């Protein structure tokens, strides 16, 4: 209420939701955690029922549908339900209960038509070309409309120890395949869920200004998926082969350069590791 902070985590068993739960555990912060089997964000009656019981003042919205290629076709309906309907439901619930809403969005809200070396800023106009990115942008607009107190954090290429991601896909494939093909003409930056969870909590702990923030891990140089995969699999007996995006017919028309400018997040005081340092820490944390 006005005197008690009450934290609700949605999508709490995802890779980001789990990371955040563990982070708040470390800091001795209490929360209520829900995922599909406790509060299906597409069911507005269930969302209302949970909010009536919990009365959150702060909601970390980590539920999402993030299968980019499936969202173009076989998962098109579920992508829309979770990322549009679900986003609207959570933003409306937060507005009704007066809760601050931290909404995680994506670098894929941009069209990607930006020269290598240039970066997308929070004030740039979204124009997404993937089903996934379209629905996340609609989720941003719902949050903007219904949650008066909000942080929209656009992140990218998310990986961490507590769910499925590009890193574990690559390692699984390397267990039985000697040659892998990874695009070298799609530019962006990985984001470790631990960095993202820490930034999520840095904004709220320090009551930074509401609005939009870009958060990926950082890079001294250009980064493509190939660069990421090459580093992921450097201890493996697999050849990572750079290809361009026309080498194989892809279902999703992914942005060619969705590298996010990080100046605004840096201006908060938050220190952003490079993705190389983050990946090394991810490997160390996974041993726990
Ligand atoms: N995977 C990426 O590279 C990537 C890239 C850009 C942005 N993001 C954003 O990161 C956020 C979450 O990241 P993640 O990597 O942990 O995704 P994730 O797939 O690991 O898990 C997200 C959680 O959403 C849950 N969920 C789905 N539908 C639900 C529903 N109807 N009700 C309740 N829960 C539901 C899922 O079961 C899951 O636990 C999302 O906002 C995503 O859009 C991710
Ligand atoms: O492609 C996939 O299914 C996983 C994925 C999702 C979103 C983004 C955008 O950052 C990148 C990768």
Per-domain residue ranges of the chain: 2-165+189-218+259-273, 166-188+219-258+274-288
Q: Of these residues, 108, 132, 151, 226, which one is catalytic? A: 132
Q: In this structure, which residue's CA is closest to atom 11 in ligand 2?
A: 157
| Type and span of the H or E element at 159 | strand 158-159
CATH of domain 166-188+219-258+274-288: 3.90.25.10
Please check whether the domain covering 2-165+189-218+259-273 is classified as CATH 3.40.50.720: yes
Is the Cβ atom of 80 under 6 angstroms away from ligand 1?
no
CA 120, CA 212: separation in Å to the nearest integer?
12
| Type and span of the H or E element at 155 | strand 150-155
CA 58, CA 208: separation in Å to the nearest integer?
14
DSSP string covering 132-145: HHHHHHHHHHHHHH
**How far from the centroid of its chain's Cα atoms is residue 283's Cα?**
19
Q: What are phi and psi of 107, to 5 degrees?
A: -60, -20
- On the CB side of 163, CA atoms within 13 Å amount to 19
DSSP string covering 100-116: EEEEEEEGGGS---S-T
Strand partners of residue 167: none
Q: Is 41 annotated as a binding residue?
A: yes
18's tokens: 């789990």
CA 116, CA 223: separation in Å to the nearest integer?
10
Is the Cβ atom of 64 under 6 angstroms away from ligand 1?
yes
Counting ligands in written order, the one closest to the CA of 153 is 1
CA 276, CA 272: separation in Å to the nearest integer?
11
- Reference 140, options 76, 61, 206; nearest CA is 61
DSSP string covering 240-263: EEEE-TTSS--SS---SB-PBP-H
| Type and span of the H or E element at 16 | helix 15-26
Calculate the alpha carbon distances from 257 to 134, 178, 270 in Å: 17, 28, 24
| Sign of the torsion formed by the C-alpha atoms of 44, 46, 52 and 58 | negative
- Reference 267, options 209, 195, 182, 196; nearest CA is 209
Q: What are phi and psi of 161, to 5 degrees?
A: -80, -10
Q: How many residues does the chain have?
A: 288
For residue 5, the CA-to-ligand 2 centroid distance in Å is 33
Give the resolution in Å. Answer: 1.5
CA 168, CA 232: separation in Å to the nearest integer?
9
- Reference 14, options 229, 158, 132; nearest CA is 158
Give the three-state DSSP class for 278. helix
In the block, residue with structure tokens 């574990």:
168
What letters, b where the CB count within 10 A reaches 16 and e where it falls short, cover 177-201?
eeebebbbbbbbbbbbbbbbbbbbb
220 burial (CB, 10 Å; 0-12 / 13-18 / 19+) is exposed
Q: In this structure, which residue's CA is closest to atom 8 in ligand 1?
A: 106
The conformational region for residue 257 under phi > 0 = left, psi -120 to 50 = alpha, else beta, is beta
CA 77, CA 70: separation in Å to the nearest integer?
10
- Reference 223, options 183, 164, 283; nearest CA is 183
- On the CB side of 12, CA atoms within 13 Å amount to 19
The torsion angle over the Cα atoms of residues 223, 135, 148 and 90, rounded to 10 degrees, is -110
CA 157, CA 216: separation in Å to the nearest integer?
8
CA 112, CA 254: separation in Å to the nearest integer?
8
Give the three-state DSSP class for 199. helix
Task: Using DSSP bridges, classify how beta strands 158-159 and 100-106 pair: parallel, antiparallel or unpaired.
Answer: unpaired
78's tokens: 């579920």
For residue 67, the CA-to-ligand 1 centroid distance in Å is 9
What lies within 8 Å, CB to CB, of 266 at 6+ separation is 272
Q: What are phi and psi of 167, to 5 degrees?
A: -60, -50
Q: Is 7 annotated as a binding residue?
A: no
* CB 125, CB 132: distance < 8 Å: no
CA 173, CA 167: separation in Å to the nearest integer?
10
* CB 59, CB 98: distance < 8 Å: no
CA 103, CA 117: separation in Å to the nearest integer?
27
151 tagged catalytic: no
Q: Is 156 annotated as a binding residue?
A: no
For residue 104, the CA-to-ligand 1 centroid distance in Å is 9
């Amino acid at each position: 209420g006005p005197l008690l902070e009450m934290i609700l985590i949605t999508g709490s068993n995802g890779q980001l939701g789990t990371e955040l739960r563990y982070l708040l555990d470390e800091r001795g912060v209490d929360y209520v955690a829900v995922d599909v089997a406790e509060m299906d964000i597409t069911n507005e009656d269930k969302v209302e029922a949970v909010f009536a019981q919990v009365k959150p003042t702060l909601v970390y919205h980590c539920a999402a549908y993030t299968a980019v290629d499936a969202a173009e076709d076989e998962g098109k309906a579920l992508n829309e339900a979770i990322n549009v309907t679900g986003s609207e439901n959570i933003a409306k619930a937060c507005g009704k209960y007066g809760a601050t809403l931290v909404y995680i969005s994506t670098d894929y809200v941009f069209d990607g038509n930006k020269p290598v070396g240039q970066e997308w800023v929070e004030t740039d106009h979204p124009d997404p070309k993937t089903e996934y990115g379209r629905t996340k942008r609609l989720g941003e607009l719902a949050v903007e409309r219904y949650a008066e107190h909000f942080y929209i954090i656009r992140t990218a290429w998310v990986f961490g120890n507590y769910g499925k991601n590009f890193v574990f896909t690559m390692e699984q494939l390397a267990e039985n395949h000697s040659r892998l093909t990874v695009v070298n003409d799609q530019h962006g930056r990985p984001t470790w869920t631990r960095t993202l969870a820490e930034f999520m909590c840095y904004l709220t702990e320090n009551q930074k200004a509401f609005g939009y923030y870009h958060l990926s891990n950082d890079a001294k140089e250009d980064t493509t998926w190939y660069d990421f995969a090459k580093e992921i699999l450097k201890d493996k007996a697999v050849e990572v082969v750079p290809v361009d995006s026309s080498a194989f017919p892809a279902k999703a028309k992914r942005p060619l350069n969705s590298t996010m400018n990080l100046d605004k997040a840096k201006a908060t005081g938050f220190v952003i590791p490079t993705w190389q340092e983050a990946l090394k820490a991810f490997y160390q944390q996974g041993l726990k």
